[PDB]
Design a binder for this molecule. Sequence first.
Ligand SMILES: [Fe+3]
Ligand SMILES: [Fe+3]
Lengths: 144, 144
Amino acid sequence: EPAAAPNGISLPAGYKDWKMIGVSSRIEQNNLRAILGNDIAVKAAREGRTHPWPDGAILVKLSWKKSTHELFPSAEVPGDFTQADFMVKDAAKYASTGGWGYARWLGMEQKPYGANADFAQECMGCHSGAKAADYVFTHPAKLP
Amino acid sequence: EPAAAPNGISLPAGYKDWKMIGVSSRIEQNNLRAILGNDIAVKAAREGRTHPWPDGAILVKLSWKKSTHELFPSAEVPGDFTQADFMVKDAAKYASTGGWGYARWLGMEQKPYGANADFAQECMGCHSGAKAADYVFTHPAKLP
Ligand SMILES: [Fe+3]
Ligand SMILES: [Fe+3]
């Protein structure tokens, strides 16, 4: 198993099998991202129960470097896998970080991010800008 | 329930719950895409059984117009849903179109695309360029 994050969160097993919530592309990072969630998160996302998200919801964002497809240069496609970011909802347990447990694992080798157990204050530094939306930027993508 | 495509392919039920294969962004369409697959496709993708893909594999590409996140302008995120494109592998049934059944549904209204039953020749026009990769451009995104 990969090492736990410095705040004690273990890597959610099976996240690559989870359902999609959305996708994104971060210009400044030259990354394509997929956002998945466990079934608690997906149910909440689809039913709009995101104020707050429920206890047990886990979101995962998977980031790859952007490359261009060798056969179709206008298609930006994933190259190198760069990291997996997680938010785990537990209003009581992570009340000090807004009710979410943050954790990041880097690369194929899955090195836990962060110098110490307060690393999540970095995450909060930006995610506080989405405080009105329970610290979550992502808007579930529309589907029929 | 949505009408079948002009070549007789019915919309696959439950595609929104399928596992992810990849993501992409098409620069000339200003979209973001998620590529999902049924469990045959996902197993094939993950094992590298793509030369050729096995019969029964279904790939779906979901497309949204790109929007910029209101709280974070360098984040391109899905706006309106534009289309669902499908490729259904059946080397015998779809031998005339490279072993793949193509189909597209447009919009939230899931209107079948295509003027007639030969609409898939359009798809083949470009997809023939990926013939070395069994007519599939997408490279499964690498995950640990
Ligand atoms: Fe973040
Ligand atoms: Fe295509």
